[PDB]
Design a protein around this ligand. Structure first.
Ligand SMILES: Nc1ncnc2c1ncn2[C@@H]1O[C@H](COP(=O)(O)OP(=O)(O)O)[C@@H](O)[C@H]1O
Ligand SMILES: Nc1ncnc2c1ncn2[C@@H]1O[C@H](COP(=O)(O)OP(=O)(O)O)[C@@H](O)[C@H]1O
Ligand SMILES: Nc1ncnc2c1ncn2[C@@H]1O[C@H](COP(=O)(O)OP(=O)(O)O)[C@@H](O)[C@H]1O
Ligand SMILES: Nc1ncnc2c1ncn2[C@@H]1O[C@H](COP(=O)(O)OP(=O)(O)O)[C@@H](O)[C@H]1O
Ligand SMILES: Nc1ncnc2c1ncn2[C@@H]1O[C@H](COP(=O)(O)OP(=O)(O)O)[C@@H](O)[C@H]1O
Ligand SMILES: [Zn+2]
Ligand SMILES: [Zn+2]
Ligand SMILES: [Zn+2]
Ligand SMILES: [Zn+2]
Lengths: 151, 412, 412, 425, 420
């Protein structure tokens, strides 16, 4: 089972995003980091590992994330929090480890986790595996995780 | 969570007094049988309390690192009846990895129904292990005032260490530590940055240098200049008006201490936040000292200038006054009765509250009168505290000596 | 505990009305798909309540036996967080053995902290299973007054059957059932034994015959004579003075019912212990009836002769009066406010208690006046009740008819 | 956990007896399911959720199955009890999957029996997941969810708010005609004798449901078969009858006056929410925030809640007031208590909010709450007293028809020369 | 591991058991059943399956059980509740099944479970296996299970349920007569001198158990042996006695006797309350008058304490009587509406403090009324009571009949309320 999507360099940019200029300004460091991580790394700068995007359904959270990846010309690896619903054993925790493995292989890239609330409300087995995978990667990897939630 | 050393005292800046206290914990973890054959018993639990970001988890990690011993991390919120099982399992895991260190962040979440049963299971697990095991539990909390007294009882977390916010010296040393991995320019003056960041924690400083690095990188620079550091600074710092209020409060407490009839040594005044028997006079005096800060605030700024800073001193003073009345029968009106509290008539509760109010107001009026009397040499002390951030008890006494006032010899 | 039939309705003596009620449960357990394809929904939970030893577990066992379906037994006291798990597991086991019966003795122990969390787990397990499963839960309690109202809510134990103590007829039938396995002499008159045991339960009678058998065996006899039965009897029976008190109380309730302005049919007076809308007058009348028993006790025996028998009727009357005042705003003084209760001022609580006392005393004085008025035909009714143990509503009315008093037509 | 998908004929409106008014209501649902595109092009907007509530065996699943049948659309049946667990958040996943399955089989009907089991913590997470799945699908999909309950009184109010199961139809127990019409339907496949009088059988079965009658004729058929007969005589029907409650006319009058009371308050309110179908449903059946409400809006909501009781007192006196006003009184007081202690809408109490409070403040709060309720109760009573004559007329119509439309209420008042506020639907 | 003992026909009988004749009488049906179970079975009689023996350590619980087996000439299968402490898996539950298997093989026999509290406080795995094994055997088998405990308060209620250990017998500490009879039994093997007065020794041992007395004579024998004597004199017995310095003080005894006499006097005078029995220093519809009388009896002990010793001599012994009396008074007022002031309102166990005050006032009224009544009664019969207490101090236990006879001597006719 399961399904992780990879769009090596997207076509959505900030021109497809409207009226959140303050937000656009905030995330501009994430774009600049994804463009060249070693510029940051060669100074001692440590950007965020995870960025939480929260708002009502349809306000453009996946859109903003896709535009961040597009503006930086970096792969966008999409996955849903509901896709970490284990089918026997602790297969949920394995999927998390695999997602980050895939990401590190496609670096510099962006991980996108829609519905992070589904995996972050055996439940604490996948949740903890996500937490350890977050603590597992560094700025050296050149990757960023953006999660989106309505709740 | 189970980690290994990789962090020592070289990554911990300052808190040399704290570093000295915990040195027995590091010596015990290195070889527990030396301490076991000795006959001595180290603490089972050690409580680390202070503001968020002051380096409580860091100190604990450094203790484990210096001793070359596993560090088993866990948080208080990670603990329906399954809460009590997790506690039993954590200690089981620890005993298997001995000599090692247990770390409990947010102990207040588990130590303030399921919320009261896991607490007992922790208490019994604490009483379950011995010095023979060669393990030590270090707990950390930002709210020790809301902690269950049972947790601090002998045998369990009976050792408590307060980790303070860094002073100007402390801030500079932290900046030096966190500047090691950064490409800073020659023009950057970390001594200035320390002076410019009163009120910040080690974490805030680490973030300030991190933010400056990210700015310099974004800007397209091969070094971090003062420009970036000032920009990162603007992006939590004590206002000069705020500083004046803190200095008046702190001076207030010290003056009470250097004038209070009996005991308790006074020490280092700074603009930064039992095996013994005490008599009624000693406790009246301790209340007098606790109200000193606020008394100074009112004398200097008026009833509208009194501040939120007196919060703990007021709590402590009232807690001490209630104990005098309802526990130690130090009230003539109430008598030598001791009430430890849902079997007591409202009339007695009223009589108790009245007496507690009597004691506090008596002492508050006394403290205020003392501040009013030494207002001019106090103004002088506050001017020194504002300039230097930290002054010695000796310095305070010498400033009063200049105004022809000989204070009590109670320093160090 | 998991048992199989081996006990039917032939082992249950009397309670033919109850036997008739539960007949749908036996028909459903026999083939649930007939009831499932039907569209009808049987009860999920059935509560059996009565005094200890009246045959609640027996009836449940007979239901399972008559249906030829497994009987899974458990008790309420057999349910720290592991209590909720046991409930989940019981229903799991039941669904695996379907069509079958779950039996919960002492449901009051689990249905009155760990004591309040297992309760919810039972409630959710009750809401968890459907008619499709083909299972039914029968609970038994000696204290239904202390049961949590949540348990009796729709979907969970919304069916309740009261199993009473046996009347003279009932006692004889039980004795016959328990005499089957005993070697009784020709001289033994079980009809007499029934007459001689008012107040005993089926269990007491079973023990009485068992004790008589053990005596006859000890004595060295091949049969059980009346001697042994009288000896076993002496070794729980209602005194004639006690009987008089019960009869006056019971007559009291019936007289109120046959005189109360509106509704509720009166039925069978014996010396043995919502989808509808009601108006203020209907409830005043229901209170009037409930106080009738006690009102008769005082009128006939004085304030020192009032008895413990009025316990439930007094509780019920007061419970109804509080609901009128605090829930249905039927008090002019309190008004149309509804309080469902730790946010309410003591002044309102006082005002509520006052009004409840007003209603009860009003009605108690009314009831007393009615008993005082019909004291002579009541004495006549009590004489009949003492002689016959049980009288029909019609018989009561006919006794009053003799004293030239025409009562309300409210029987059956 | 499973779900059962029904493919289309077998059950249509010809298998449904005597609920012609209900059949007329649901006719838009049958038309929409036939071609969802044609009805949105026309302008008709359909409900997302339709709640069918009544006693067990009253033909709720039957009506739902007939709706799907008449429309020639898949019927996806499920039970509320299948979405409970405590152990793991798998309950919420099943809900998401049911709607996923439905969207794949569109145009189709979702049927949720025992919605009360999932609508009353792992069960709460499932309840919310249902609520979000209801808000997740649109008219573009071509799906309608029909839920059935025997216990609508214990249903979570969240389930019935707009966008969710905002349409509710009460299916009643069959009267004598109803019972007769059902008997006729279920007698079609049975070989009945000439001597059998189904009109008598209808009078001889008061209180039975359509299910009970279906079983009565089925049992009579099995008894005639086991006796060795080709026909079913009255003998077998009487025998089948034996093998196996009510609402008073005085009680009915009280319910009708109470219900009319609420409707009059609603149609006079000064500012409120829409009023609909006034009916005589028994105590057992029958049934906020998120947005901003002013002090006048809340005074009006209290006014409406007290309407039922106000009518009870005006018509029957202080001794005639009933237990039926129980929830109205609770709700009204809860709302009054929020106005005073939470929203500082009391001048006496001030703009203070109580979430550890002196009894003197508690007294002051209780006093003000009593002031508000009595004020509104006197207002409601005055309104009932004013329109007592056209109300008596409404109650008389309600008693004979057992259910009257909001429009019918307004046109009765129109007869008495009184123009009410334009609410209804 | 584990160990089950089998004594096919024991040598201890009722001659080895002293001073529990009432208990001996109770268990006589168990003896008669074990002798011939088919006599019982052929009539439909079903004796108890389990019999619980509870009392202080050393009162003779294992002894009584052994004597039951001996009198019936039936095997005695002994086992300890602590021997069902599983060593891996559920081996505890297997041992239970095996014990009953062994018993059925040796029928008619007796199972004896010492320390039943150890297995009946995985824990519920062995406990449940015992419960199912109890429900597993019938009267046809001809076997009986006798369990003994020192701590019955910590016993699982499931164990005492019908079909299981539904019969419970309390074995008490010996009174003066009891003690003397025990001493006689244990003196049989001992070479005692003529000067030894066992009657004195019994009087000098209030509070000792049969075991303590057996040990006292055993210690005196060892003392006489070590001294180099063929006989045991009073010297050795007094020396052996001194190893007793948790006994009953004579002043303490007087207080207990006055309290106990207090209750009995209330009972033999109470207007319609029912049945008085055995006064010892050793450990349904009711009307308003009946309950006033029950309170009167409960306050009797304390009333006697005050009348005899003053307000400074009243003791902690009245603790439960006072609690019970107040609980009963509270029920009369708040549950049974037996107060005119409160009325016929019922508050089962939300209330205004005014009602709570009114309730407490009425409860205080009832108790004080009755306490004054009880005190007046003790004051009235103080002289025949002094006589009863003097008899109760020397005999430790007196029959209700004996009490009434003492009063008869003082020309006072009491109510015929002795248990018959
Ligand atoms: N600010 C916006 N500017 C432009 N299009 C937007 C904006 N917000 C939403 N949209 C559009 O709405 C659709 C849904 O956006 P989406 O990111 O999936 O919502 P959500 O916040 O739930 O993830 C997209 O097709 C997107 O182009
Ligand atoms: N005294 C200090 N010296 C050096 N770094 C510090 C100091 N205090 C805090 N830091 C840094 O700040 C961060 C936060 O410290 P931490 O121990 O996790 O917080 P807390 O005190 O809430 O437990 C760490 O990365 C640590 O390196
Ligand atoms: N109505 C009855 N008919 C026959 N035997 C009865 C009856 N009531 C009780 N008994 C007998 O008394 C005993 C106790 O009944 P039981 O159902 O266990 O008690 P309870 O009502 O407390 O649940 C059983 O052995 C049963 O045979
Ligand atoms: N109105 C009715 N017309 C015809 N048959 C009916 C009617 N009501 C009930 N029945 C029959 O009774 C049975 C049970 O109906 P069902 O739909 O399961 O009821 P509910 O969903 O309300 O529990 C069905 O076989 C149905 O055909
Ligand atoms: N009533 C008694 N009569 C005779 N000997 C007794 C009596 N009570 C105890 N003993 C003696 O005390 C000893 C201990 O008895 P035992 O039954 O083991 O005590 P327990 O009640 O703890 O089981 C035995 O040797 C027994 O003979
Ligand atoms: Zn201070
Ligand atoms: Zn009664
Ligand atoms: Zn209403
Ligand atoms: Zn006593």
């Amino acid at each position: 089972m399961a399904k992780v999507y990879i769009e090596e360099k997207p076509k959505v940019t900030f021109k497809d995003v409207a009226g959140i200029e303050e937000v656009k300004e905030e995330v501009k460091e994430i774009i600049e980091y994804l463009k060249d991580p070693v510029k940051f790394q060669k100074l001692g700068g440590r950007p965020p590992k995870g960025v939480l995007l929260y708002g009502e359904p349809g306000v453009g959270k996946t859109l903003l994330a896709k535009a961040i990846a597009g503006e930086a010309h970096v792969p966008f690896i999409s996955v849903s929090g509901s896709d970490f619903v284990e089918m026997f054993v602790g297969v949920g925790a394995a999927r998390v480890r695999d997602l980050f493995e895939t990401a590190k292989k496609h670096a510099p890239c962006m991980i996108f986790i829609d519905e992070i609330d589904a995996v972050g409300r055996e439940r604490e087995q996948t949740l903890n595996q996500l937490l350890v995978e977050m603590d597992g990667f560094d700025t050296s990897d050149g990757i960023i995780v953006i999660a989106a939630t309505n709740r | 969570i189970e980690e290994k050393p990789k962090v020592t005292f070289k990554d911990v800046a300052g808190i040399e007094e704290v570093k000295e206290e915990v040195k027995e914990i590091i010596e015990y973890l290195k070889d527990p049988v030396k301490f076991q054959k000795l006959g001595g018993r180290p603490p089972k639990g050690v409580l680390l309390y202070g503001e968020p970001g002051v380096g409580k988890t860091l100190l604990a990690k450094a203790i484990a690192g210096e001793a070359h011993v596993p560090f088993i991390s866990v948080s208080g919120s990670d603990f329906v009846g399954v809460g009590a099982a997790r506690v039993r399992d954590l200690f089981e895991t620890a005993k298997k990895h001995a000599p090692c260190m247990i770390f409990i962040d947010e102990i207040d979440a588990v130590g303030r129904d399921e919320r009261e049963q896991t607490l007992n299971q922790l208490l019994v697990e604490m009483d379950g292990f011995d010095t023979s095991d060669g393990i030590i539990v270090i707990a950390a909390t930002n709210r020790p005032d809301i902690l269950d007294p049972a947790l601090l009882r002998p045998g369990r977390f009976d050792r408590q260490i307060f980790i303070p916010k860094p002073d100007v010296r402390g801030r500079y040393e932290i900046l030096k530590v966190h500047a090691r991995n950064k490409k800073l320019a020659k023009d950057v003056d970390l001594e200035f940055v320390a002076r410019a960041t009163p009120g910040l924690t080690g974490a805030d400083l680490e973030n300030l240098l991190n933010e400056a690095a990210l700015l310099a990188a974004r800007k397209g620079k091969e070094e971090i200049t003062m420009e970036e550091i000032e920009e990162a600074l603007d992006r939590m710092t004590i206002s000069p008006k705020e500083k004046e209020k803190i200095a008046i409060h702190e001076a207030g407490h010290a003056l009470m201490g250097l004038v209070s009839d009996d005991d308790d040594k006074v020490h280092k005044i700074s603009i930064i936040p039992d095996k013994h028997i005490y008599d009624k006079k000693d406790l009246y005096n301790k209340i007098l000292v606790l109200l000193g800060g606020r008394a100074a605030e009112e004398v200097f700024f008026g009833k509208d200038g009194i501040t939120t800073g007196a919060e703990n001193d007021l709590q402590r003073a009232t807690d001490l006054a209630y104990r005098m009345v309802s526990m130690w029968g130090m009230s003539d009106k109430v008598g030598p009765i001791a009430i430890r509290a849902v079997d007591t008539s409202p009339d007695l509760l009223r009589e108790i509250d009245e007496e507690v109010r009597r004691i506090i107001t008596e002492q508050y009026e006394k403290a205020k009168a003392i501040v009013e009397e030494y207002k001019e040499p106090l103004k002088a002390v506050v001017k020194k505290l504002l300039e230097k951030e930290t002054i010695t008890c000796e310095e305070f006494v010498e400033v009063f000596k200049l105004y022809g006032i000989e204070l009590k010899d109670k320093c160090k």
